[PDB]
């Protein structure tokens, strides 16, 4: 029956379905409504999502992630070459096309970036099928607004490899605006700002809406700013603490630092609705239990410059859109980091107390909108 919406995200992916009058954002078998865009290969299994993410410390070189950054690209792309340094997995050259080389079941294997993204997509496809009790084929998949044709065609190709028929490739900030029904309003054209802060990237797009038609007037942001960086500012806080308490540097230690990063991401989320979080790691480094505390005030202090600095791309987007901030009619909160109370305040203050569209889990908003659009592009939504 139904067509689904899939947010194919740099760090997390999310699938939703328009069904029986509502959009349901669908939890995976672990209970999670977003799913890491991670593929891990071991001696015995190909792991996707959480199981892949949870083992990245014991198996760093064979846990692929960040394929969205390789998709639609040539190997000799500046961006590919820059980013490669940061990854623990190997990226090889297959006639001007990036591949990822891994060890899977004793053998060396390489995969194209759309093949990795196809694995994530297959995983999301199964999540929807488990919920719906039938097979899913038709889907709308989303991409960043700045994506070119080659990147859009590669994302569509990823769907086909996942056994999906892709009804459309649509832009992320547009989906989020569809989630809010911003196009179902009589009157003069509306300027909409999409403030989107995920796990790896920061996107600000301004959009005009009149008669249900969308155009992108401007975009800005930082392809290397997201919740991961706030996690980093936390890791090093605790690397330093650990050292003072124990006279040991866990910094040489790749698995110790990875294990602390997970602890840290977990506490950061707790800090979005509570004012302190506990860190609790058994045998972090050479047999030492690491238990500690962090407050929201402190978390915010360690990130004060990156939080505040998300306002530059906003200003920049407005001046490219040739708009003063008071000419923005709707502001939309997207990406799981927009849950961080301080981020909320700083954007609102900037817009002089104007109320922010956030009633929909910001990390689910893109998938929400893709679900709406998938129903429409089928005929599951009339009148």
């Amino acid at each position: 029956g139904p067509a689904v919406g899939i947010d194919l995200g740099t760090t997390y992916s999310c699938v939703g379905v328009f069904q029986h009058g509502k959009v349901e954002i669908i939890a995976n078998d672990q209970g999670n409504r977003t799913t890491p865009s991670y593929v891990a290969f071991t001696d015995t299994e190909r792991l996707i999502g959480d199981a892949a993410k949870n083992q990245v410390a014991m198996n760093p070189t064979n846990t692929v992630f960040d394929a969205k950054r390789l998709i639609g690209r040539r190997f000799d792309d500046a961006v590919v070459q820059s980013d490669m340094k940061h990854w623990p997995f190997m990226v090889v050259n297959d006639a001007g096309r990036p591949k990822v080389q891994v060890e899977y079941k004793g053998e060396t294997k390489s995969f194209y970036p759309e093949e990795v993204s196809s694995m994530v997509l297959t995983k999301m496809k199964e999540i929807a099928e488990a919920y719906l009790g039938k097979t899913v084929t038709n889907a709308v998949v989303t991409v960043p607004a700045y994506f070119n044709d080659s990147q859009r065609q590669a994302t569509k190709d990823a769907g086909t490899i996942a056994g999906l028929n892709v009804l459309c490739i649509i832009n992320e900030p547009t989906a989020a605006a569809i989630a809010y029904g911003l196009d179902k309003k009589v009157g003069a054209e509306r300027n909409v700002l999409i403030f989107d802060l995920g796990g790896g990237t920061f996107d600000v797009s301004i959009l005009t809406i009149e008669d249900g038609i969308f155009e992108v007037k401007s975009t800005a942001g930082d392809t290397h700013l997201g919740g991961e960086d706030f996690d980093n500012r936390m890791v090093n806080h605790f690397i330093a603490e650990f050292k003072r308490k124990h006279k040991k540097d866990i910094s040489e230690n790749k698995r110790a630092v990875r294990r602390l990063r997970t602890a840290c991401e977990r506490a950061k989320r707790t800090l979005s609705s509570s004012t302190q979080a506990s860190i609790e790691i058994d045998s972090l480094y050479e047999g030492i239990d690491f238990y500690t505390s962090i407050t929201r005030a402190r978390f915010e202090e360690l990130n004060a410059d990156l939080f505040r600095g998300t306002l530059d791309p906003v200003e920049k987007a407005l001046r490219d859109a040739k708009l003063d901030k008071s000419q923005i009619h709707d502001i939309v909160l997207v990406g799981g980091s927009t849950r961080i109370p301080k981020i909320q305040k700083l954007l609102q203050d900037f817009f002089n107390g104007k109320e922010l569209n956030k009633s929909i889990n910001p990390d689910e908003a893109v998938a929400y909108g893709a679900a709406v659009q998938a129903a429409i592009l089928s005929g599951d939504k009339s009148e």
């Binding site: 459309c168 008669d211 038609i213 155009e215 429409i376 592009l377 009339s382």
Partner: protein
């Protein structure tokens, strides 16, 4: 406007009759459209023929291909009326 009135008159007279809509869709298409040959009733008798031509119609007017185009608003309108026509045809 003249382009929207056209399609809204087209929908009205044809009474959600898929064959009637298909055999006259060429009269409401945007000037510029070349991918569509006018189809007579001769090619709309059997449900095979309706289906085959319907699946050819929705490709022309798909809202995804039409995104950004000056005619986008009209592609949407025709798409939606055809989807409803076809679902009425399936239910028969």
């Amino acid at each position: 406007d003249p382009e929207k009135l056209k399609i809204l008159e087209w929908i009205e007279g044809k009474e959600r009759n898929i064959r009637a809509l298909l055999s006259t869709m060429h009269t409401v298409l945007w000037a510029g459209e070349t991918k569509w040959k006018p189809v007579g009733m001769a090619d709309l008798v059997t449900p095979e023929q309706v289906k085959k031509v319907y699946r050819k119609a929705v490709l022309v007017v798909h809202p995804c291909k039409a995104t950004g185009q000056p005619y986008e608003q009209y592609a949407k309108m025709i798409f939606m009326e055809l989807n409803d026509a076809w679902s009425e045809f399936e239910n028969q």
